[model samples]
Target: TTCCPSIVARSNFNVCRLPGTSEAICATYTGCIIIPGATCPGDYAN
Candidate 1:
């Protein structure tokens, strides 16, 4: 999970890893959007 500003601003995105799994999760503020140019690496790209 992640947290962001409520005003629809963009900050550096962060990744969260599951405690016992290899999954990563992302979170952002409500109404916020992710820029389309971002890239994922490693297992995320699959």
Candidate 2:
């Protein structure tokens, strides 16, 4: 699911890997963190 309405700050689908780790996560276009079950468009790993 690409819809992440729970996050009021995200405008588009974005995923990022945590610095210095293999933890890929859902994020905002502005690089804000997203919580679990928020639903992202791309790969969402922990």
Candidate 3:
């Protein structure tokens, strides 16, 4: 299972916000699941 990064604001704990931005990118496995907005073109998959 995927997990959130340890570094995040207290109010938005456990959620990964974009670097220097307030946008949140809900955690998801790059290959394990096909996240609608989280998946990227070069992400490893099997």
Candidate 4:
């Protein structure tokens, strides 16, 4: 039950950041991506 799972399914890359961090990239957990190097606190991946 995560929107992030669907977003990455169609795209090659995703944006991610701290728990409450994400803007211009992802403001919510739905569209946020927990890609390497840009790992978020507690994980935001689907």
Top-scoring candidate (lDDT) = 4
Query: Between which residue pairs do clashes occur in model 4?
Result: none
Model 1 agreement with the true structure over 3-46: per-residue lDDT tens digits = 23432332223222334332222333322333444533322331
The per-model lDDT (C-alpha) reads 0.31, 0.40, 0.35, 0.43
TM-score (C-alpha) between model 2 and the true structure: 0.19
Model 2 lDDT tens row, 1-46:
2343344434333333334322344443534545446545354322
By TM-score, rank the candidates, best first. 4, 2, 1, 3
What is the lDDT, from 0 to 100, of the residue 8 in candidate 4?
52
lDDT of 4 by residue, 4-35 (tens): 44655424224433344334344343454445
Over the stretch 1-46, how does candidate 3's per-residue lDDT look in tens digits? 3322332323342334335433343333211233456544444321
**Candidate 3 segments whose C-alpha is farther than 4 A from its true place:** 1-31, 39-46
- Off by more than 4 A, model 1: 1-29, 37-46
Q: What overall lDDT, based on C-alpha atoms, would model 4 receive against the true structure?
A: 0.43
**What is the C-alpha RMSD, rounded to one decimal, of candidate 4?**
9.2
TM for every model, in the order presented, reads 0.17, 0.19, 0.16, 0.20
